[PDB]
């Protein structure tokens, strides 16, 4: 992974030694080059994962997450360089440094063999994320959002550290390849019930699970655009990625310990979808849509079937590109009217015809129109959940209906109807903005041609 | 104070600490404590004001009392063993008295009341000696007598220190009182692991001293003693605010910073001994420390507080403070985690 | 060696340099009372360093290349604006007096440092000890608020206590009616707006508070308008003073070392002039503060520490 | 209640440069920032990556 770690570290000198007016050009150009080379991780075999060294390995679960991560960096830079135009030069270079260091921690998080190395990087991602929200957020509430983000995470992460360390004492290793062969069953007992909770609750908070989600709509409403892109696209998927790994050593206790969390997810996805129907803030709406989508991922991981993991992997990738695109679209509106209220600016298809096309495409993926990878992921989870218990089709079906309702509600409210008379500063969409949206949607639709590369290790 | 007199007294503070750490005889250990106390009082009284006099008096009364329980423990040990060698004590009452004596010297809860008041009442440079160098001598004794220490007593002191240190810091705006309650909380971690692995007590003590010196040195750099005055630093030395943010996040124990190393290694040694509840409780309660560290970051680095017009006169003058070792200490406070296995040198 | 405990240990002690001529002299008086002429002539005859009265741009004159900086870097406080509209909403009146006291505080520290390190006396025009007379005059006229005076007294209390008062306090008495007339002859249109009640308050403060207080701690010489004209007769009075009172009798090399440490460190001198007391007249919002501080570092020779700016000719930076 | 810089005006990037791509105020830098995004983003990653 050095061929990806080292060039990522080199982005820091490049930004700092770049000419004053070339920071965005140089960082964007070379971070795109790194994203290009990330495709070499697709050297995946049917039986054995790609194990480079004692420290890093790559399988079909981490590879699409790595490619999504390195793709997101140049996209984050394009999205940020307009609202940071008046920022001090050295503070620009520090903002880019926080994003580069977030990529550094993320690519090492997804490739660490051992769970303690994964834990340290899993937690290191907090520091840059917290700094971005609080230093470069816009409103007063960014300080509270940083605190809820920090302490919700740690309240779950700290028990996980204890549990992981205990596992190494008893098993002798936390290397994930070793755990595959030395995994022993978990028997019933209160000591194991709390070991199960310790191993899972840190990841539940990241997804986030329904009930423990109230930090996420806070962070999204207060983060700068780049913060919201990485938070939605990748950082949420740290919890899912960790679950797909750690459930290996929690069997068969997952058989009955999953019941409280499947009920929260199955009912929670209906509640959070319905909340989206009454949201007044466009960013909060998109935030509450992530909670609904990630409820499917939680259920899929917890029922542990070959179809459910294949669906879980596709959703995390599909959701990552769609949610990031939706945040960028809303942000482009915000950069004009300087408000996140959804009802403030209406009928924008009249004034920005091509940006209404992007709004349409993003909404169609969000509601999982086939054959988008958004639906391939959703369908696989529904197929497996049906075999789990046939009644789940009722909750799954209702959620799809409501999911279409608020997805098109948002499109209709902002793009259709009559425009707002007194808003007269809606400038034509910039080439930067149009390219930003296309670099989300075009990969997302391209993946329907070769969906195997995002289905995960159980393909 | 004469410069030569200041140096001689400062060397006597160190001499007393060294005597405690190289002595094999309980009487010489006691002498080392008396010598250290006699030489630190004039450093507290240096600026001669009613608050320094109050701090020095409260320090003397607490240290003088603790020294008396220590000597009582030594004499009881002589009665029941007929020897003076510094090692495990031979009487459970001697161990209790010596353990309480050392808890008072360290300012551990519920013997903690003096630490916030004495630290507040003395200059920053004297507070630096108090919260760092003065921890070495009592800890070196604990390191040598831990086999006879009562487990329930030592772990109760650890738990109370972490809770009271965590809660006490929430209500503070004075930097010297925030560092005092931070010190109490961190002492609890050092003693919590002492029954299990004394090497981790040393690791935690060393890293705490590095980070505490880094904060005090940066407070001294701008002569800041309150939250609000510290909030003007961004408008004077922007670099100093980034160093404070990084160090405060490290003290809070966040990966991938150095300050996570002691919490990580102590949790490991306690779980090897089937201690799960205590380290879990300790880590969660340490979130109190992270909370009132985070506030300092908000008012210092991550926002920009209102300044004053006269601040502009300061833009034209360079920092003149010595800031000794600050570049090295700040790097050690933050970037040591990759070198954690180096802890075996303390073994 | 820069001065410090090591240099003091090796022999650098203030009592070596100082003599019967190492004196700090301050010339006070109302506006247009002849201070500057008298002070400059006292300095030459006695062979002392002369510090002109500390203005808004005194600090500029001691750093960088010594030329005044644009007014936005002193907070836009203006003496002319004070005379035009002393009751301004923008609080320029107290922002000026707060700034001027800090400037005087810095000049006093520089004056003391010159005396201690070289042994040569200095002559000043007003000082931190008499600066309050302008404050009281402003308050009596309602130019500033009660809170501003409270703030001024807070700052003064924690800064003036560290220093030693002047050996000699030369004072020139010129009654207000003559001061009036001498202002028009100056021809500055802004000064001529000065009211006599304002000048009377200045006089009352000098004769009500300053002179009585300084008599217990310094040598005070009062002169009338004509008495002040013969600078030689003023110097003659100074040369035969007894010097038998005040805190300078109690100073020993241990105390003067501690004093010299303070005055050579200008950020320690100015520490408390910016205490976090949020008066409207001296509070600056984050955006204004940040934007102006960026401009300041863009001035020639100001980005880096003196001796490391190669945009103004500094050399060997890679070995410094 | 203090000395504050008022709220700055919104700056339309188009008025100074009607041909702005929205990347930068300087036209030459704005052209280069567009070429790298399009060439590397579309011509390289998406076409050769696909």
């Amino acid at each position: 992974m050095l061929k990806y770690i080292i060039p990522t570290i080199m982005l820091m000198p490049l930004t700092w030694l770049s000419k004053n007016n070339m920071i965005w050009v140089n960082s964007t150009a070379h971070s795109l080059l790194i994203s290009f080379t990330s495709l070499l991780l697709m050297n995946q075999f049917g039986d054995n994962s790609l194990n480079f060294s004692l420290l890093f390995f790559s399988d079909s679960l981490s590879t699409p997450l790595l490619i999504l991560t390195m793709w997101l960096l140049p996209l984050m830079l394009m999205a940020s360089q307009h609202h940071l135009s008046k920022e001090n030069l050295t503070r620009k270079k520090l903002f880019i440094t926080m994003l580069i260091s977030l990529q550094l921690f993320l690519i090492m998080t997804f490739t660490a063999m051992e769970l303690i190395l994964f834990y340290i990087l899993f937690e290191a991602t907090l520091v840059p994320t917290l700094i971005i929200i609080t230093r470069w957020g816009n409103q007063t509430e960014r300080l509270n959002a940083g605190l809820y983000f920090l302490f919700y995470t740690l309240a779950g992460s700290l028990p996980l550290l204890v549990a992981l360390i205990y596992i190494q004492n008893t098993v002798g290793s936390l290397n994930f390849l070793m755990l595959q062969y030395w995994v022993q069953p978990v028997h019933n007992s209160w000591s194991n019930v709390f070991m199960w909770l310790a191993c899972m609750m840190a990841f539940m908070v990241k997804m986030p699970l329904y009930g423990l989600h109230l930090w996420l709509p806070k962070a999204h409403v207060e983060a700068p655009i780049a913060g919201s892109m990485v938070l939605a696209a990748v950082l949420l998927k740290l919890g899912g990625y960790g679950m797909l790994r750690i459930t290996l050593i929690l069997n068969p206790m997952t058989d009955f310990m999953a019941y409280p969390f499947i009920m929260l997810s199955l009912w929670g996805m209906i509640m959070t979808s319905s909340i989206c129907l009454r949201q007044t803030d466009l960013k909060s709406l998109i935030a509450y849509s992530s909670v609904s989508h990630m409820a499917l991922v939680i259920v899929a991981i917890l029922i542990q079937t070959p179809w459910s993991y294949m669906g879980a992997t596709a959703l995390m990738i599909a959701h990552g590109l769609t949610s990031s695109m939706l945040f960028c679209l809303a942000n482009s509106n915000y950069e004009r009217i300087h408000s996140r209220t959804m009802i403030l600016a209406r009928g924008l298809q009249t004034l920005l015809p091509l940006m209404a096309t992007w709004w349409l495409l993003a909404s169609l993926t969000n509601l999982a129109l086939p054959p988008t990878i958004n639906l391939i992921g959703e369908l696989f989870v529904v197929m497996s959940t049906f075999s789990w218990s046939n009644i789940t089709i009722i909750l799954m079906g209702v959620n799809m209906v409501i999911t279409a309702l608020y997805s098109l509600y948002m499109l209709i409210m902002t793009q259709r109807g009559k425009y707002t008379y007194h808003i007269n500063n809606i400038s034509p969409s910039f080439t930067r903005e149009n390219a930003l949206m296309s670099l989300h949607i075009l990969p997302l639709l391209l993946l329907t041609l070769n969906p195997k590369i995002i289905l995960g290790p159980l393909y | 104070m004469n410069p030569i007199i200041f140096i001689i007294i400062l060397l006597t503070i160190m001499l007393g600490t060294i005597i405690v750490m190289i002595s094999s005889h309980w009487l010489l250990v006691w002498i080392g404590f008396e010598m250290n106390m006699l030489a630190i009082i004039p450093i507290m009284m240096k600026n001669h004001n009613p608050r320094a006099t109050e701090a020095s008096t409260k320090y003397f009364l607490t240290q003088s009392t603790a020294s008396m329980l220590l000597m009582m423990a030594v004499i009881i040990n002589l009665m029941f063993s007929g020897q003076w060698t510094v090692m495990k004590l031979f009487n459970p009452m001697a161990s209790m008295l010596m353990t309480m004596a050392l808890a008072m010297k360290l300012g551990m809860a519920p013997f903690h009341f003096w630490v916030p008041e004495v630290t507040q009442g003395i200059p920053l440079s004297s507070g630096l000696i108090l919260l760092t160098w003065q921890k070495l001598a009592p800890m070196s004794v604990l390191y040598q007598i831990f086999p006879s220490i009562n487990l329930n007593l030592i772990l109760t002191l650890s738990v109370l220190s972490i809770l009271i240190g965590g809660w006490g810091g929430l209500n503070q705006t004075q930097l010297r009182k925030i560092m005092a309650y931070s010190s109490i909380a961190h002492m609890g971690w050092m003693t919590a692991v002492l029954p299990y692995n004394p090497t981790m007590t040393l690791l935690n003590l060393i890293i705490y001293i590095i980070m505490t010196s880094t904060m005090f040195t940066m407070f001294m750099a701008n002569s800041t003693t309150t939250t609000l005055s510290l909030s003007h630093t961004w408008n004077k030395t922007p670099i100093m605010t980034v160093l404070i943010l990084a160090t405060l996040l490290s003290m809070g124990g966040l990966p991938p910073l150095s300050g996570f190393m002691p919490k990580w290694m102590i949790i490991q040694e306690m779980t090897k001994n089937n201690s799960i509840i205590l380290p879990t409780f300790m880590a969660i309660t340490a979130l109190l420390n992270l909370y009132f560290y985070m506030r300092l970051t908000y008012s210092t680095t991550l926002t920009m507080f209102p300044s004053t017009n006269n601040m502009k006169m300061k833009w034209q003058f360079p920092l003149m403070k010595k800031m000794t070792f600050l570049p090295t200490m700040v790097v050690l406070s933050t970037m040591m985690l990759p070198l954690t296995p180096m802890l075996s040198v303390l073994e | 060696l820069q001065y410090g405990p090591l240099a003091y240990i090796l022999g650098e002690k203030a009592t070596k340099k100082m003599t019967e001529k190492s004196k700090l002299i301050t010339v006070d008086g109302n506006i247009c009372s002849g201070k500057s002429k008298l002070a400059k002539e006292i300095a030459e005859k006695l062979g002392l360093k002369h510090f002109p009265e500390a203005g808004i741009h005194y600090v500029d004159s001691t750093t960088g290349d010594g030329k005044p900086l644009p007014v936005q870097f002193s907070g836009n406080c203006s003496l002319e604006k004070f005379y035009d509209d002393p009751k301004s909403n923008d609080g320029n009146s107290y922002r000026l007096q707060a700034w001027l006291y800090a400037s005087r505080l810095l000049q006093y520290a520089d004056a003391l440092e010159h005396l201690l390190s070289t042994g040569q006396g200095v002559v000043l025009e007003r000082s931190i000890y008499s600066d309050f007379v302008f404050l009281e005059a402003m308050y009596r006229q309602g130019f500033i608020r009660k809170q501003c005076v409270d703030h001024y007294n807070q700052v003064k209390k924690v800064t003036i206590c560290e220093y030693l008062p002047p050996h000699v306090v030369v004072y020139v008495d010129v009654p207000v009616p003559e001061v009036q007339s001498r202002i028009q002859k100056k021809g500055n249109p802004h000064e001529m707006k000065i009211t006599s009640a304002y000048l009377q308050d200045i006089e009352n403060a000098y004769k009500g508070t300053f002179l009585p207080e300084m008599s217990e701690k310094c040598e005070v010489l009062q002169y009338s308008a004509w008495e002040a004209q013969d600078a030689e007769k003023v110097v003659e009075d100074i040369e035969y003073l007894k010097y038998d009172k005040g805190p300078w009798l109690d100073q020993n090399d241990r105390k003067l070392h501690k004093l010299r440490m303070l005055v050579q460190d200008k950020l320690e001198v100015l520490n408390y002039t910016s205490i976090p007391v949020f008066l409207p007249e001296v509070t600056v919002g984050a955006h204004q503060s940040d934007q102006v501080f960026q401009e300041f570092t863009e001035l020639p020779g100001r980005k880096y520490r003196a001796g490391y700016n190669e945009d103004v000719g500094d050399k060997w930076i890679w070995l410094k | 209640r203090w000395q504050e810089d008022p709220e700055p005006e919104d700056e339309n990037l188009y008025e100074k440069n009607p041909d702005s791509h929205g990347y930068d105020k300087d036209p030459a830098v704005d052209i280069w920032n567009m070429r790298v995004v399009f060439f590397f983003g579309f011509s390289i990653v998406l076409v050769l990556g696909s």
């Binding site: 816009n138 300087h338 | 209500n171 506030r295 008012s299 | 949020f278 955006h287 | 203090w2």
Partner: peptide
Amino acid sequence: ARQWQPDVEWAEQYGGAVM
């Protein structure tokens, strides 16, 4: 819309003897 930064009313929350 300019980024919000602490004002006097916000900063006075930290100027008291206690929090």
